[PDB]
Amino acid sequence: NGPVDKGSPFYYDWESLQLGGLIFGGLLCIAGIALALSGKCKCRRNHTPSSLPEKVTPLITPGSAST
Known part of the structure; x- marks a missing residue:
């Protein structure tokens, strides 16, 4: 017995x-995105009023810095 190791x-x-x-760290991340998934299904039909x-x-507006 030696819980100290x-x-x-x-x-x-x-x-x-x-x-x-x-x-x-790489695993924690995989866990981070996972949690997001529980919020992706909604963001797919709801998404954000800016990110989408x-x-x-470009198709709705020029999207050009000039002209």
Whole structure:
């Protein structure tokens, strides 16, 4: 028994907190977008009054800095 881990040499197995640490961030992200999904289905039919007319602005309005 040694919940400390620093008791046996198997403690040096912490290196994972490093290599995995980098993935941790990548994983957290995957978790971030996931939550968004629960808000994408609505944004698909509701979307925003600005983010959506952005790709439809050129067809609805000139979209040119001049002329």
